[PDB]
Ligand binder design. Structure first.
Ligand SMILES: Nc1ncnc2c1ncn2[C@@H]1O[C@H](CSCCNCc2cccc(Br)c2)[C@@H](O)[C@H]1O
Ligand SMILES: Nc1ncnc2c1ncn2[C@@H]1O[C@H](CSCCNCc2cccc(Br)c2)[C@@H](O)[C@H]1O
Ligand SMILES: Nc1ncnc2c1ncn2[C@@H]1O[C@H](CSCCNCc2cccc(Br)c2)[C@@H](O)[C@H]1O
Ligand SMILES: Nc1ncnc2c1ncn2[C@@H]1O[C@H](CSCCNCc2cccc(Br)c2)[C@@H](O)[C@H]1O
Lengths: 336, 336, 336, 337
């Protein structure tokens, strides 16, 4: 099941329209260019590896900041288009497009710095951070990585409207006489399938019932295998009383340069990006009072479809009110 | 039990506050006075039986119309108060209060006309109509009854907000860990109990999806036993497409006098009364298209709680989509 | 009495009532805290749950480690309780016994009795008597949860609440209501309104003196002690003004081996569905700050599972007195 | 690429949400129920094969019409759910759910009638009509197919905004300094990529410039291989003057029973369905006068991705002006907005 979804993934990224959609996100493109250009000393006369370069934009940023040689690896057919852009911008002596997967190609040389845009939904979808970490085999002993660190933020939320939307969709299968047919036997199954879907969109920050818990991956130290099973303990101190309908996820990445640390944030308090935010709904919400603690674990298991199985166990400590939920990030509901 | 329900019923009607609340309904009181006074020749020098007179207001209307003798039968303690008002209004020679049930008291004389206010929610609640029909044992052959007829109007409606309200209430019992306790096994029962509740309130007529079907009871012709089982067939021609969440009920009564026929209407196209309107919800709504026929039966079976067990079977004939519902008219949801 | 008892148990047969009581977080949360934080009183013990309803308290006792819990319920709700015991897989530890605690058979004396027997003013519905009756199954070292109950009384000033009674009763003070002179009933209407205890909450500023506390020790009290409750009071007025009546609230204490947990319905505490109760004087009494208001509140158990309330109060320094009779079975729910 | 394509396809159809989305389409479900119930004589005490039954709704309709035995074949995981419903509606004696592809499973008995919903975009997308026709090896000689026939309708359209959209979108690349990068060299490629996408949406019928040309497939007569290469000649009698930007496509299917013929239509003159309509743009527009003829061919080549490559050649006969396009139906642009 891994090979087929990998084929579909790279076919999806072979399209210029996807490159345009991602490049038109000005937060992404502008933050990356700021991180690279304001840290020009991390690129001046340096060797760069651009992992999953796509159309090559990050490599062009590296060249703008003064890089001597940039190896831009790309496994999709977009590599060819990148080469076209390298020629038409007269950067053939500085940007070397290397077609293929970063786990299989040969570089002639170790690099001073690795740059990439490997973030997916919840920072981890598409599992490309594993390729980003794998590329560290080419990194000189004290080399740098752009982005350097990644923070996933989790926070309980209340949203009755979203819960009722999904619950009603599931309740379609509560009908006992749909065109004279009893569907009710499948209702449970339907509910399960509907609540396994993470909800990808934005929201007002006032739905957040507690301060976010932060889980940090240091890309300078993380190993690829570390991303196969990600265990995130959490303990929220509730600031508002009400129903917890689930957990909201967003992420920031930090480019820790020798001049400046530049943050790319997809937080709901920041301008919207094409990453949006992700929300895992409980099949049944948990009541809590302000001052209570909501504690548990979010376990992300990498699956062979370049996504994650999400398991959220969360309990209100004061009453012992527990919730266990399973989700699949490969079937997200693009609500917006 | 029947005895205990009757005890509670008459204790409820012993309170002056209930008399005030019913009498402050200007549609009820004003329409009754209009029907009696504009048909004064049906009362001039006549013999009147007031069934369940309460404080006696209808007996006073009959006296204003010139009734020679009015027997005002009341089983609650309110009978005493009626006598006070008879004495303080100097009508001791024309209004005779008779305490007790009309089924058990003895009147000295056959009456020219019976007047009563026997209508409950859906016109049938409290089963007082039976007592009303029973009073015909005292009616002269040329006698009349005010009200003379009663029309029950049914009409399919769409109200997603009401359905969502009741469903959300029932969803409390879907919790797997309410204070660590699994309630979900009762959810079905919960849903049933919530959708057995008739919803007593008013609504905009724009929620009605077909012209009303009318079921008429002729109080002059009807016998008491007829009200033990009431079958109301219906075949609506759907005027709008969408979800039928249930059936709405209201009623009219006609005082068919000699001079004039006067109508008392509780329809949603009419000024609101304390009867409001009554809606019966379906646990699963029925999708219908304009031009379809929604056919079925409403069955009222008299129970020992001075009320009716209601069965409503409806189906969209084009698709065979069917809905069977039970409603306990002894547990209404007053939505205001 | 039977006609009221059957209606009482029919009322308590509905899942909506159980849900409304369970959703009161003060009630359910305080019971769970008291049982769990006194787990040494429950670990491996025999427990009797008097009037278990849906069984929630029995589940709390099982969570604390009870070896066997007998949960007795007289309404049809007992059936649902059984469903919850099977679905939570506690049949070997929780035995649901349908019927009244005075009539069912327990196979074993219990280590501790738990119950939620509190009504309005702590005594309404008379279930405390059943609670005390259950002591026939208590071992000589047995404990009661709740262990004690304090009823608090305090004089209040509310000119507008007093005004409302006459504004409502003055409906009857009309010489031509549709041509009928209603005035002769005005006095009765007034009396009827003043005989209603007023169930709602209020600002603690309306209290004119520190409360007087009357305590029932459930470990020592006998059933017949609750048939006639005499509460003398001598308030030392902290403010000058008119006293329109007495305000009532209550607390109960669970006195466990580890700690004592209080459940309070005081107006200084968060609102519960018990609210607070206010009994007006027919005529207010003027008191200066520093005067003493002395008198007696006599609660007499009646045949409708409630109490007749006789209140006699006087300002000692002036001799002004007021005497008032109320029926707690017909309270006026004023909260909106 | 059949392996990845088909595993993705069946995983897509394993979801109850997709089944519900198809069932809630009242045109689809209602028309199928009408065609089966109003032709009860074709099902009463009959043997029925349901091809790709999904949750089994069509098998339940056939049961409503009195079918003696119904084999419901489903290749996705939805078969499990189908089985559940068969048990929960007390029809295990009459409906047998067979999990697996209709080309690979073994039906013990020859059937009197085959029912299915194999239609995709342009009636041919997802290539399930091939499985529907392959199922005829289980059909009795006098048997029937529900649906019986299928008409694909082509019609020239004018949509200036739609045509200009492609160049507006591709012109993102026609920038000499996008964050300091000259993207211009890719603009042309972008254009090509946009023009290879059939546009799935609806439109007002007034953009249609001529009566549709209809290509009929008769499922009772057609062979599976007939759908590997579909050549649709067209000559349109232009009813309006203007610039033709491409061809619009929709389809109907007809259930031809003993009692009645029932039509399920996805035409733009009919209420919208989840099939919408499909529009393929020419590379360059062609001016045509009303009374001119627009002639050419739409050649559908079945490809390995359970879809079709669409080759379209058109010319205004009275002027000789011509245009063409080659589109990939596996990657349509969902424009419904
Ligand atoms: N092993 C590999 N070797 C070489 N290249 C590889 C490898 N894996 C992947 N790639 C290439 O990197 C690129 C994907 S990462 C972009 C991640 N942002 C997604 C995104 C989601 C939501 C909003 C926004 Br806004 C952006 C593609 O070009 C892909 O083909
Ligand atoms: N067998 C009997 N013999 C003698 N009297 C009897 C007997 N049964 C009953 N009554 C008396 O008739 C009266 C009840 S009918 C009023 C029905 N409208 C209700 C109502 C509902 C919603 C809105 C509005 Br506005 C009014 C009471 O006084 C009652 O004590
Ligand atoms: N002799 C008996 N034997 C067995 N069970 C019995 C017996 N008497 C009663 N019960 C059961 O106990 C339960 C009633 S107590 C709830 C008292 N809170 C009321 C209340 C009022 C205001 C606010 C809030 Br908040 C709660 C019912 O389930 C009832 O059926
Ligand atoms: N060889 C096979 N053997 C057995 N079953 C098979 C086989 N191939 C597929 N199937 C099953 O047939 C079903 C097809 S979906 C109905 C096709 N309309 C789509 C559609 C598109 C736009 C709008 C709307 Br409205 C509906 C799926 O369940 C699929 O799993």
């Amino acid at each position: 099941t891994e090979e087929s979804s990998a084929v579909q993934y790279f076919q999806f990224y072979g399209y210029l329209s996807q490159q345009q959609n991602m490049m038109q996100d000005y937060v992404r493109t502008g933050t990356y260019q700021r991180a690279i250009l304001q840290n020009h000393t991390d690129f001046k006369d340096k060797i760069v590896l651009d992992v999953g370069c796509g159309s090559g934009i990050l490599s062009f940023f590296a060249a703008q900041a003064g890089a001597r040689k940039i190896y831009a690896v790309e496994a999709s057919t977009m590599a060819q288009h990148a080469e076209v852009l390298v020629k038409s911008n007269n950067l053939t002596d500085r940007i070397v497009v290397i077609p293929g997967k970063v786990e299989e190609v040969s570089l002639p040389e170790q690099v001073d710095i690795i740059i990439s845009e490997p973030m997916g939904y919840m920072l981890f979808n598409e599992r490309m951070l594993e390729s980003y970490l794998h590329a560290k085999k080419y990194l000189k002993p004290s080399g740098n990585m752009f982005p350097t660190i990644g923070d996933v933020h989790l926070a309980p939320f209340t949203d009755e409207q979203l819960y009722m939307e999904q619950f009603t969709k599931a309740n379609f299968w509560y009908q006992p006489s749909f065109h004279g047919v009893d569907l009710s036997a499948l209702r449970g199954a339907a509910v399960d399938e509907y609540f396994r879907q993470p909800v990808v969109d934005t929201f007002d920050i006032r739905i957040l019932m507690a301060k976010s818990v932060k889980y940090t991956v240091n890309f300078l130290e993380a190993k690829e295998g570390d991303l196969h099973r990600i265990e995130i303990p959490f303990k929220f101190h509730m600031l508002h009383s009400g129903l917890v309908h689930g957990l909201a996820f967003w992420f920031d990445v930090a480019f820790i340069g020798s001049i400046m640390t530049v943050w790319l944030s997809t937080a709901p308090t920041e301008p919207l990006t094409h990453w949006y935010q992700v929300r895992c709904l409980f099949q049944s919400p948990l009541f809590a009072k302000a001052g209570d603690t909501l504690s548990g674990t979010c376990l992300l298991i990498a699956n062979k479809r370049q996504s994650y199985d999400i398991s959220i166990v969360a309990q209100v400590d004061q009453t012992g009110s527990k919730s266990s939920n399973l989700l699949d990030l490969k079937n997200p509901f693009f609500r917006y």
